[PDB]
Amino acid sequence: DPTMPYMVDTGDVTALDSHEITISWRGDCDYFAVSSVEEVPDEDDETKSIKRRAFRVFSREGQLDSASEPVTGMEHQLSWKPQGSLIASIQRKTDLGEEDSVDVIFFERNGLRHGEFDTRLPLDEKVESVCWNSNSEALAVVLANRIQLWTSKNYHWYLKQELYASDISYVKWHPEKDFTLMFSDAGFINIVDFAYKMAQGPTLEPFDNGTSLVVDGRTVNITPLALANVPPPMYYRDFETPGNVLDVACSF
Amino acid sequence: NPEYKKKYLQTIITAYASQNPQNLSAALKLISELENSEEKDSCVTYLCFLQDVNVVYKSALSLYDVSLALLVAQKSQMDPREYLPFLQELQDNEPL
Amino acid sequence: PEKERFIQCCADITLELTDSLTSGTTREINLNGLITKYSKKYKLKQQPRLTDIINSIPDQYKKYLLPKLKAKPVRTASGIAVVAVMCKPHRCPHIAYTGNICVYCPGGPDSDFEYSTQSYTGYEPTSMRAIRARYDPYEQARGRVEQLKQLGHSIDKVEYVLMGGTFMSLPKEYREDFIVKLHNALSGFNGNDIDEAILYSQQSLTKCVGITIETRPDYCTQTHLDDMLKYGCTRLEIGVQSLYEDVARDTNRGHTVRSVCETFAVSKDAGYKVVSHMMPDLPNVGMERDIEQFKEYFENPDFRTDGLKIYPTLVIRGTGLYELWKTGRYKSYSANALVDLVARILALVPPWTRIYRVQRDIPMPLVTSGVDNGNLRELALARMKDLGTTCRDVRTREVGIQEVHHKVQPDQVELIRRDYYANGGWETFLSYEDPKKDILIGLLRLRKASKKYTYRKEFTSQRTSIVRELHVYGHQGFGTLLMEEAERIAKEEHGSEKISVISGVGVRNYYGKLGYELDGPYMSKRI
Amino acid sequence: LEGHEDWVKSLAFRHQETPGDYLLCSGSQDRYIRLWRIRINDLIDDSEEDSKKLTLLSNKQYKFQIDDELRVGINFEALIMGHDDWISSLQWHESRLQLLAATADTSLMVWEPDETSGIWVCSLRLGEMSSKGASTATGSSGGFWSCLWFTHERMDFFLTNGKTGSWRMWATKDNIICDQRLGISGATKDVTDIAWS
Amino acid sequence: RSDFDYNHLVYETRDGTVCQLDAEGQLMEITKFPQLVRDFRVKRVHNTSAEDDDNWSAESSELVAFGITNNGKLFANQVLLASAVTSLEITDSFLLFTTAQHNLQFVHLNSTDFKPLPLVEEGVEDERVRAIERGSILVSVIPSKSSVVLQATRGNLETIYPRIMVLAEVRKNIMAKRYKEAFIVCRTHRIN
Numbered sequence A: 001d002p003t004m005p006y007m008v009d010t011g012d013v014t015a016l017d018s019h020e021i022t023i024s025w026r027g028d029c030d031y032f033a034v035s036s037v038e039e040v041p042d043e044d045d046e047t048k049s050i051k052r053r054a055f056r057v058f059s060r061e062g063q064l065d066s067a068s069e070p071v072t073g074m075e076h077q078l079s080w081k082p083q084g085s086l087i088a089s090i091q092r093k094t095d096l097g098e099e100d101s102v103d104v105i106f107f108e109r110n111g112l113r114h115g116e117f118d119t120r121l122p123l124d125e126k127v128e129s130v131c132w133n134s135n136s137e138a139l140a141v142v143l144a145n146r147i148q149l150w151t152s153k154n155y156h157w158y159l160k161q162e163l164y165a166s167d168i169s170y171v172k173w174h175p176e177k178d179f180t181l182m183f184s185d186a187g188f189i190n191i192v193d194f195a196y197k198m199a200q201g202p203t204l205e206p207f208d209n210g211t212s213l214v215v216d217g218r219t220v221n222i223t224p225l226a227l228a229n230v231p232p233p234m235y236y237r238d239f240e241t242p243g244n245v246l247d248v249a250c251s252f
Numbered sequence B: 001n002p003e004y005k006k007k008y009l010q011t012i013i014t015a016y017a018s019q020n021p022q023n024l025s026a027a028l029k030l031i032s033e034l035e036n037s038e039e040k041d042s043c044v045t046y047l048c049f050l051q052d053v054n055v056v057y058k059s060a061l062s063l064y065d066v067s068l069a070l071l072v073a074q075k076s077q078m079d080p081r082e083y084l085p086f087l088q089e090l091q092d093n094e095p096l
Numbered sequence C: 001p002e003k004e005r006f007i008q009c010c011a012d013i014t015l016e017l018t019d020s021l022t023s024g025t026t027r028e029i030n031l032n033g034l035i036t037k038y039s040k041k042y043k044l045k046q047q048p049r050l051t052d053i054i055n056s057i058p059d060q061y062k063k064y065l066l067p068k069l070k071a072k073p074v075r076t077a078s079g080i081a082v083v084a085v086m087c088k089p090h091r092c093p094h095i096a097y098t099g100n101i102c103v104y105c106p107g108g109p110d111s112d113f114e115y116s117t118q119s120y121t122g123y124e125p126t127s128m129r130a131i132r133a134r135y136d137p138y139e140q141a142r143g144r145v146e147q148l149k150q151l152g153h154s155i156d157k158v159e160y161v162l163m164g165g166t167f168m169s170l171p172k173e174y175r176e177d178f179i180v181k182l183h184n185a186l187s188g189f190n191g192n193d194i195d196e197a198i199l200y201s202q203q204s205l206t207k208c209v210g211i212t213i214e215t216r217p218d219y220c221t222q223t224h225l226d227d228m229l230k231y232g233c234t235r236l237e238i239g240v241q242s243l244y245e246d247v248a249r250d251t252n253r254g255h256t257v258r259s260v261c262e263t264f265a266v267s268k269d270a271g272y273k274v275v276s277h278m279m280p281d282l283p284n285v286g287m288e289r290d291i292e293q294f295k296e297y298f299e300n301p302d303f304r305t306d307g308l309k310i311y312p313t314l315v316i317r318g319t320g321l322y323e324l325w326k327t328g329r330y331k332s333y334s335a336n337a338l339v340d341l342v343a344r345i346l347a348l349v350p351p352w353t354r355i356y357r358v359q360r361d362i363p364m365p366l367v368t369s370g371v372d373n374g375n376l377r378e379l380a381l382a383r384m385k386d387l388g389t390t391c392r393d394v395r396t397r398e399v400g401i402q403e404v405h406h407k408v409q410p411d412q413v414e415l416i417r418r419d420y421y422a423n424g425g426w427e428t429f430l431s432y433e434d435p436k437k438d439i440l441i442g443l444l445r446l447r448k449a450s451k452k453y454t455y456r457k458e459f460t461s462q463r464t465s466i467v468r469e470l471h472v473y474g475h476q477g478f479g480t481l482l483m484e485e486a487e488r489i490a491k492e493e494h495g496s497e498k499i500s501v502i503s504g505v506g507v508r509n510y511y512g513k514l515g516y517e518l519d520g521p522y523m524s525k526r527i
Numbered sequence D: 001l002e003g004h005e006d007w008v009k010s011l012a013f014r015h016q017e018t019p020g021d022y023l024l025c026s027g028s029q030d031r032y033i034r035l036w037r038i039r040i041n042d043l044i045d046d047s048e049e050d051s052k053k054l055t056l057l058s059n060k061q062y063k064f065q066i067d068d069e070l071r072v073g074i075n076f077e078a079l080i081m082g083h084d085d086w087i088s089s090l091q092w093h094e095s096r097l098q099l100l101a102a103t104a105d106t107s108l109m110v111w112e113p114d115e116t117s118g119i120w121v122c123s124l125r126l127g128e129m130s131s132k133g134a135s136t137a138t139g140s141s142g143g144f145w146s147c148l149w150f151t152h153e154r155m156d157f158f159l160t161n162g163k164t165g166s167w168r169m170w171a172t173k174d175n176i177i178c179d180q181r182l183g184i185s186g187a188t189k190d191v192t193d194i195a196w197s
Numbered sequence E: 001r002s003d004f005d006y007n008h009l010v011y012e013t014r015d016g017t018v019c020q021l022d023a024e025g026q027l028m029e030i031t032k033f034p035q036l037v038r039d040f041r042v043k044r045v046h047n048t049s050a051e052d053d054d055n056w057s058a059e060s061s062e063l064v065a066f067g068i069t070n071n072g073k074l075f076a077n078q079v080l081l082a083s084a085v086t087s088l089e090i091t092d093s094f095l096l097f098t099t100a101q102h103n104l105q106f107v108h109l110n111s112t113d114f115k116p117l118p119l120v121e122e123g124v125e126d127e128r129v130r131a132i133e134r135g136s137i138l139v140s141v142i143p144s145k146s147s148v149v150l151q152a153t154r155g156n157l158e159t160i161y162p163r164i165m166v167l168a169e170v171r172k173n174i175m176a177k178r179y180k181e182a183f184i185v186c187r188t189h190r191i192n
């Protein structure tokens, strides 16, 4: 029998979860999100209650406003995109084979899952937290010894940069000016700043084609606009790398 | 060049109809001067699409020809009762 | 007498105007005044109209003097006379396998209305025309085209719309009969076989320049798309109403958003053009999520459809929403709030997407609560001007409305080309436009048939670029320019060996002079 | 033959009651009818061309050889105006020079040559009783299909499809007084239930 | 980044000073800026006029660096030609920038001396400025096709053919005396 409703698929908790409650303010600072680990005596096999990770969204007056969708494998990560939508968290998704990849997931103020992107991180990698830029344009993912920068032009979240450090405690964004990240690497205060750049090929009139190269972490996509004006979410004959690319340039 | 007149007639017609003095006399003269019944009618249709049919028909009259006038008057929407007797009377009289 | 002097007044007016116009002379006093000076000798209520005098001109003079009163391109020059018809009332498919019908569709077969088709209230002009024709396609089409002829239009490119419920949920014989009847009422052929009807309509005068069939995402499978392309369909209209799955679930919608997106991809890869319906003020949405979904709609490269239809949620008696609005569970927006919301949404419409309509024309005396006025777009544009930003909609930048509303003429035409990625495909959007004044003169969409989703035996055989839509409104050799540039793109930019344009059966001859040969339901051309 | 501007719905030759010449009518979708004069050899009656008679192009005469010798000089003869809609069916008379035009505007009428100016006028017209074929609320485009026209002793019967599966009769004595006689009926689609009284 | 002609190399220091570099490895301080710029370009621009001096030659060279910072201000050797610009791209004989006033602005690269440009008032309607959709950032330029490729904020590419580039192509083809390739190219971009 064809049906409209979708099955329940109750959530659960992971193994590398950090059992500390976390709090995030949204950019307008009119609601805040609190994430915790909680166990519920669910109707599904009420004999033994199920422990998982959940969160709630409260108003500025402390009033509880919304609960969260029960997702199988949320972690202690949680951050609110300063635009005011898409609370960002992370998920293990470790039930069935080849479906196992830690992925950043999104939620709304209703706490109903809405969109995600698959971090190309190894399954066993430990992720400390996530963050958002001041203007909500870039999202930083922090791990034990490396930070990742993500952006999105057409919902295709690129891995723009990966800063390699030794021992990362916390990572912050500059509030008044975006693209200025700071962190504490092994007892050192480190400041990094970023700026958009067009990886342009030569524009010199003899044999030029606007060979714009876009980095996608392990990928380097090509677009010779003078040959095939491919819109950005697709690309023209990309090439790969062994690791995570930092920046690219094109020969004359 | 004879070849240009052979081929690029419609250019010359456009030129004659485009100059502000509107040298339609030369245009219709050269159109009738063509020794054909296929291209000449095509050029007349082209001219009527380009230049107003009433003025071009008046110019055809002023060119002292009735056959060309009758050919044009089939593009002017006037009732044929209102010009066919006229063209017949013009046709069956002395030149002067 | 009362009216005879009116008839003879119209007669003398016609004869005198014909005599004056034969040698090329205009009138003086807008004949109605001259009409009265003779017909109102006793002033017995004789009130003529422009249609009245037009229905008096003799045939030989009528067909040649009529267009000398109208000059708006899309009105009488482009002549895409939108002629809407309706199918017999029937119950929309999902009701069977869910339990109840959509929770916001007013009217139908088992509402307080016994006569109106689903999602209709039997009071729109189309509904009275359908009933006075008893939902028969032949009478509907003949009457509408004849009413258009009477009102002085010189219509030559009839474009059909098949409104009312889901037309795709009917027995195949009935739909075949409906389409054959439409094409027959257009051309004049009196046959019964769909193949012959198409073949006849292709040569027909008063070309069937296309036909639109609003439907549902589930009923647009491969076989259904093959059926509608057999019919002659050129644009699809798909109900979406929400990108949030919870709203679709709570509205008894019966189709997931993922299904909608898949259908979008496969239909756009079948050469169609899709126009989607986008309902604001759906229950459990709120202004924040309304703006969110309308901002994502053009931002997610998966939907990005070429048309749009914003239909603010109107509650009407008898629906599933009256038993939920009466209890106060759901409260509508505010008039100012909704006007502002429409302003902000329209601020985000990209240049290629055309806003086909705004809030439904369901009568005010029947709506329980919703939009107050009936001129929502007027206030939306006024508020847009107040906010400073401006609209990029095709319909708000095309030449035809500007020449009569804005009264602005175009003088800086230039070639512009967008190139975006939608529904898994690379879609180019060529146009000739006015950069200084933002006036669109001609447009042409174009798509690279994606390997993932294309299925037509005409396309999977060799790489193909589809000219999904070509439209010229306001010398005038534009279609030629756009078509040539599209050829160049498909040869170099796309690397496609055969470029094929989907076309309404009426216009299939126009591409003949362009060197296209008819392959299946498309007008194709190898390269 | 050219002179029509739209599709040619129906056409019908007339009886060669005068050898060497007869009439052929062609009715279009553009609400026009055109009468063409077929003239066989020795009756072709050309125009003396050595003296310029100034013929119009629309009056072009098509001359052709059937085998090599029957020179046929078919020439346009008349333009019948004002049918208000398509001409679904047209048909001559047995003897008289009257042309029957059955149109799609729920109307059927009869033309004849004017006894004065040699042109054609509306001799008779029927179907003005309010109806629209498959509907009846408003008429105007949606009535009469094919027509038959046959004369008994002194009775010009007109027989016409009513776009509802029912025939319509009109019997008229000489040319004016016409009255409806009984016709037949029947459904156009499948018949399902037959309930006896 | 590399030089405009790729025969050199350039860089910028945290001081705000832009310096050069060659294949051999010899540097020279190119210029300095009022503040360090988050992006820049370099060009040894030449000059020309109606009647060129030095026996009709354009060898009057000068190295210039066009830079842009976070505040939004374009610098051509310590001068402020425009403010609040979003992005730039230089090319043979042209400099393009998006002025964040929803217009693309051209500067010909035939002046050794740079002086602040006029403001683009409302309705200027000139071959220099060109109207552009809001939020659009310039991405690339192909003079060989005379096509400026931008990318609007929502993320859909957009190729325009600005008036001045096709016009310059038309002129250079008129001198070249083809009258057909020039005519073909111009009629394609419906010209006058």
Ligand SMILES: C[C@H]1O[C@@H](n2cnc3c(N)ncnc32)[C@H](O)[C@@H]1O
Binding pocket: C104, C105, C106, C119, C239, C240, C241, C277, C278, C311, C312, C313, C314, C315, C316, C360
């Ligand atoms: C015809 C289009 O309008 C939508 N629709 C359904 N019910 C209503 C209503 N009450 N008001 C406006 N639009 C409505 C249909 O769902 C479809 O999207």
Ligand code: SF4
Binding pocket: C092, C093, C094, C101, C102, C105, C118, C119, C165, C166, C216, C239, C253
């Ligand atoms: S929601 Fe769709 S299927 Fe349901 S009644 Fe409305 S149009 Fe029909």
